[PDB]
Nucleic acid binder design. Structure first.
Lengths: 144, 54, 78, 77, 65, 49, 101, 81, 78
RNA sequence: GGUGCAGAUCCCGGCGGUAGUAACAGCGAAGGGGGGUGAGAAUCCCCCUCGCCGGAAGGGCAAGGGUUUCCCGGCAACGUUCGUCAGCCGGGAGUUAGCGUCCUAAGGUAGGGCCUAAUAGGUACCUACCGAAAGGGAAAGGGGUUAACAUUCCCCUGCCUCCCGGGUAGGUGCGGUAACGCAAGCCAGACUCCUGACGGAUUGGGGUAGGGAGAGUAGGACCACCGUCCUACCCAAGCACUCAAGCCCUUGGAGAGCCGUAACGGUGAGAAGAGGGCGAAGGUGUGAUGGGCCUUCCGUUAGGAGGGUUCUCCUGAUCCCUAGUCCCCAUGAAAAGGGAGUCUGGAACGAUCCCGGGAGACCGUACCUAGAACCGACACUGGUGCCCGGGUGAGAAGCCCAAGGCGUCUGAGGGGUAACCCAGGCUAGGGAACUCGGCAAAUUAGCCCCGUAACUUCGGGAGAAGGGGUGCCUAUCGUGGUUUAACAAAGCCACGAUAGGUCGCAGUGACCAGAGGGACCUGACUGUUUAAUAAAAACAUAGGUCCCCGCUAGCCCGAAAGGGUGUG
RNA sequence: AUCUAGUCCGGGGCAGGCUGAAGGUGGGGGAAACCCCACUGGAGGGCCGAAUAGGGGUUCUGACGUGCAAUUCGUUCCCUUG
């Protein structure tokens, strides 16, 4: 009266875990005489071998939450952060992005004749010198 | 530790295996010698005056 | 031969000393004997750490016993 | 079989329309073949983990083309 | 004291000061005897030096060219 | 198993037969309850290679 | 068996000769990065054309090819143009055919 | 030299499914050809063979036949079917 | 009692040999009989040496190693 | 004459009492209901539900055990209970490779020789060989099929090595000035060269797994009212093409400065800018009108017939390749195996090209990797491993829940539950009076900002000290990244600030999470050690100091050959 | 010498953060000697920290002490790029 055979076999034929497999509480009599992988395959279509669909983590809440998180500054305040200052945001990365964006801007300015050579170099040296802080701030300086 | 764990690491290969001659799993691979069947450095069979108590 | 000023830079660290001889057969780190058990050193043993015998010995001294000041011409800092 | 170095830890799911994801092992890279006298980083010779029997394609048509550039070579002819 | 402290407050300043003075001479800009002082030379190891222009390996001292 | 065919290559008195007594032989002997005393088991023993 | 496929037939227009190539796609993402630069793609496609049957020096010595136009669709038909410097241009035409049984 | 024709429930399918034969030979521990043995004993061409070392002490070989030779016939000639 | 630490080095065990395979080679003067001219081709570090060495090609086609001497470079001729 | 027994903590065998007593608790699991089987069911089976684990109780991989794997039938013991059940017993079956074997380091051996009286002794020399299932080392994957193993069997795509058959570049070719590009002869060499082949730190770019977002397509759950969530939406190798750094090729000619970086830097020795070449990962086609994925319906023995399996975007690896740069009194293995270059001789036929054909020993191949498969005498909280989802959250921290697994870390049921013990929680008021000793236990604790003494080796001390804010929601704004994207808009996405309103005792609400300060002694510190009574002031240390010694030295070891500090 | 001691050879690992020496660059103070500030830079037998990431075994002389076991278990510590 032990027939793990059927229970074990179904998991392989469906690629799911054993515990996620169920039989008909009725059709035990017509499932015992299964002896082959052929038989389990034939029986699964006949709905004797009911296969449990994979469940999942419902995620509607976090969809609302993240959207709540993102747009309106919800919970992001500095009074709710476990890590240290730079932990969330690597300042080195910011400087990398900062130094990058200003450079390619003035390149585009030179190759489009926005400014001259001597203007460029003085602008460039300042960038390495941390003279500016922002794309808007640096671009504002151009009109003096 | 000196107690049971000292026996723990003891799953590796036997430092004495089946020497082909005397049917005793007593061939020290590590020493390139059998301490039982004598094969390895004596052409003659290892035999002693005191195989037992006299 | 190159290597001038070789020892001017301090080792500053037993780690350096450890990797200075990592390949040379010098036994490292060197262990003094006067604190060792007498079972394995001529000057070993004793609660009060002291020089057991005048370290200077005669030239005919047997091997394994010649220790410390060996055939010293003179001692002292000066 | 124990976690080793012989094979770059690759997987398969980009160029892929069926549904199945697994792992593969593949041996390490080569470089331009070995020895050293001019220690010059060579060029223009093919070196793949398989060899397509391409005769000249793996060697320049220069006089010492597969051998080395003209930096350290005028000691022979 | 600059480079003298890159180990913190350890091992003794007097030791540090000795290690200090010699170290700068390694990093004090030198003059390549072969190409020129144009580029700077580096000390791969005691006696090993070449700048990145001459490509001329030569024998140096433990810490000086 | 990467057994280097020195123990599995040899089969029989080495790596074989902790076997049960033949049935019909028991009928012949008429013995009370026939055994091989040489009976061993993997969990309680350590075969001497 | 796969379903739905995008067939692209690009008519190459250089000096005198008209060249057309056949090559399709599988996900509707392939198109855009195919035309991301396409200079490697097209020249190789041309080199394939020379490789597949015959002839050399068709439009190989083409210099840096200036991208293309902008891809357009009206009856869901992806269309655009790609010209290069002078005397070198290629057309773009895309079909979306259902494979079916 | 051939010794027996194994007849496990596994084997019976193979002679039908793939027209192979499960035959176990001496442990000669040297083979280039278990192949040319069969035809001088059964007049059958060979397509492939392989190596098995059972823990009971025998040496099994999966030998399969080209389609022109239905392995079930010779077995029936032998007489297990 | 049990022999000295210095005593232990007398056995010539592993704890006292050098991994000279990690070393470049035996740097002694190769035997020559007359007068010959050589050029330096490389300088390498040798671990248990505390002094750099040189690889020098011989005009007759020989490989050898000598302790490196101050103020000498690759490509110079000796 | 082995000779008369109560002992000798005698020996051996049997059985007493303590006695149905201890234990079958303690390391965070837990079952319940209904049905079935069978004599017999808390324990076995079927269904549903539920709890727990969930950087491990999951997944895959060794040495070892050796059938522990599977099928069929059983329960006297074997199982800490029982037992219809099992790794247990009984009856049968079950591992396939043209996609370890080879070479070599530590070393080792065997021989020739140097000693030993001899040797199964040592052996510096020479020779030959052994020495890795994580070193190197020719070449395949995908799907598909049995209860049992599979890159091995069935199909397709291949692929490598060698050997034949035919033509083909070749021996008598080629473009450009070049960087180089390619169907380049052949076989005997000989020599030489060129990855294989080697460390750490740090950083960028480019990739890829895994993931999310939205619409759409089919199914299920959903429901007091809402309509939301999950489900599947995707395919390798080989083959064709492809590029980002770097490094090279022409042209070009610049500084009182230019080029360029994340940074360092580059620049007249040719920078800038133009043209180019060699050229990773990957990616894209093909393979792939075959399967795979879900699913509808009819059939319901036997099968049969359809549907779709899309589109647009985002983050993103500790998984790759690709680069720079720093460090060293540490400079970070060698062979075999490959490939190429050059010169000699040979014959004229003749391929490193493609096309067709043929072949490719032998052996490893089951299972388990450990709270039951290994060892520790056991179905043992000990050790021995190794490698690898979401949210919350810096996180592989804790929590919970995905995948999967489990209710066998194997005895259970009754009860208003006495004392007591071990794990805890909480105690008014006083707050070290207990006490050798504040031991224990408590208090603080995340984060941001402000603010921070004496002293000193000037480097720290230093989260010194101390103070202030921290939630929820309605809005915003700034910054930056990203998509063919200078900027800027659009969608996304992360981060950082502002305003306002508002709730509670509590706003790092749990979880996670320093008490601190002052005086003095000792040890300079990190480190190491008394496995199974001791971690320290005990040892090592960086440094000063002295001694010996010019290689046939000095030092030390053996009988001797000599050995090692000595590739000095 | 499968344990432990040591060495050699070949291999496998250390989630995340913090701190910020040298050097580089730009401001600013004065002709100077050079000094202050900002950033960049990423050195260290440095620091915090993952029960079982890994190591050791510190107090509880905490339970067991005819064991989970002829040396543990739970608490409770220090180390973690050398």
């Amino acid at each position: 009266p032990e027939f793990q055979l059927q229970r074990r076999l179904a998991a392989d034929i469906a690629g799911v875990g054993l515990n996620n497999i169920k039989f008909n509480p009725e059709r035990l009599e017509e499932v015992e005489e299964a002896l082959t992988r052929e038989d389990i395959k034939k029986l699964i279509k006949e709905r004797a071998v009911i296969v449990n669909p994979k469940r999942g983590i419902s995620s509607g809440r976090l969809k609302e939450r993240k959207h709540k998180r993102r747009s309106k500054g919800e919970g992001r305040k500095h009074g709710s952060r476990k890590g240290k200052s730079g932990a969330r945001t690597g300042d080195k990365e910011i400087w990398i992005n900062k130094i990058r964006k200003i450079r390619r801007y003035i390149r585009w300015l030179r190759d489009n004749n926005v400014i001259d050579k001597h203007t460029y170099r003085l602008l460039y040296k300042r960038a390495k010198g941390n003279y500016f802080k922002n794309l808007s701030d640096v671009k504002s300086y151009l009109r003096q | 530790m000196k107690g049971t764990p000292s026996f723990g690491k003891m799953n590796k290969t036997p430092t004495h295996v089946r020497c082909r001659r005397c049917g005793r799993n007593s061939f020290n691979a590590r020493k390139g010698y059998c301490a039982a069947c004598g094969f390895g450095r004596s052409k003659k069979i290892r035999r002693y005056s005191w195989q037992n108590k006299k | 031969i190159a290597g001038g000023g070789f020892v001017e830079k301090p080792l500053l660290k037993a780690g350096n000393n450890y990797w200075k001889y990592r390949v040379r057969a010098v036994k490292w780190p060197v262990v003094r004997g006067v604190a060792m058990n007498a079972v394995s050193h001529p000057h070993g043993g004793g609660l009060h750490q002291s020089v057991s015998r005048p370290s200077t010995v005669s030239r005919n001294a047997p091997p394994g016993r010649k220790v410390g000041h060996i055939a010293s011409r003179r001692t002292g800092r000066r | 079989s124990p976690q080793q170095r012989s094979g770059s830890f690759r997987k398969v799911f980009v160029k892929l329309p069926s549904g199945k994801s697994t792992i593969h092992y593949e041996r390490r890279k080569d470089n331009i073949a070995r020895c050293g006298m001019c220690k010059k980083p060579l060029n223009g010779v093919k070196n793949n983990y398989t060899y397509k029997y391409s005769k000249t394609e793996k060697r320049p048509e220069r006089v010492y083309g597969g051998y080395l550039c003209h930096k350290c070579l005028e000691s022979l002819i | 004291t600059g480079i003298a402290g890159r180990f913190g407050a350890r091992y003794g300043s007097s030791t540090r000061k000795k290690w200090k003075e010699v170290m700068e001479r390694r990093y004090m800009p030198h003059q390549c005897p072969y190409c020129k002082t144009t580029g700077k030379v580096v000390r791969i190891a005691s006696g090993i030096w070449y700048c990145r222009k001459c490509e001329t390996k030569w024998a140096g001292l433990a810490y000086t060219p | 198993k990467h057994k280097s065919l020195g123990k599995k290559l040899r089969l029989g008195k080495a790596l074989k037969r902790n076997s049960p007594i033949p049935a019909w032989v028991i009928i012949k002997t008429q013995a009370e309850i026939r055994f091989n005393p040489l009976r061993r088991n993997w969990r309680r023993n350590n075969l001497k290679v | 068996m796969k379903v739905v496929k995008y067939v692209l037939t690009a008519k190459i227009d250089y000096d005198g000769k008209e060249i057309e190539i056949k090559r399709s796609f599988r996900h509707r993402k392939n198109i855009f990065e195919f035309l991301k630069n396409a200079d490697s793609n097209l020249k190789g496609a041309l080199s394939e054309y020379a490789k597949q049957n015959k002839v050399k020096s068709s439009d190989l010595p083409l210099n840096e090819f200036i991208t293309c136009g902008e891809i357009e669709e009206e009856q869901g038909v992806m269309r655009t143009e790609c010209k290069g410097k002078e005397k070198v241009s290629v057309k773009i035409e895309v079909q979306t055919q259902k494979i079916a049984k | 030299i051939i010794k027996e024709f194994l007849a496990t429930e596994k084997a019976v399918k193979l002679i039908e499914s793939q027209n192979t034969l499960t035959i176990i030979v001496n442990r000669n521990t040297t083979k280039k050809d278990i192949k040319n043995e069969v035809e001088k004993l059964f007049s059958v061409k060979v397509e492939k063979i392989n190596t098995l070392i059972t823990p009971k002490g025998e040496k099994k070989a999966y030998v399969k036949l080209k389609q022109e030779y239905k392995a079930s016939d010779v077995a029936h000639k032998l007489g297990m079917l | 009692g049990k022999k000295l630490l210095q005593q232990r080095a007398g056995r010539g065990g592993i704890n006292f040999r050098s991994p000279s395979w990690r070393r470049v080679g035996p740097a002694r003067y190769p035997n020559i009989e007359g007068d010959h001219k050589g050029k330096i081709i490389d300088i390498l570090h040798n671990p248990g040496v505390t002094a750099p060495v040189v690889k020098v090609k011989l005009d007759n086609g020989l490989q050898f190693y000598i302790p490196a001497v101050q103020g000498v470079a690759v490509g110079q001729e000796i």
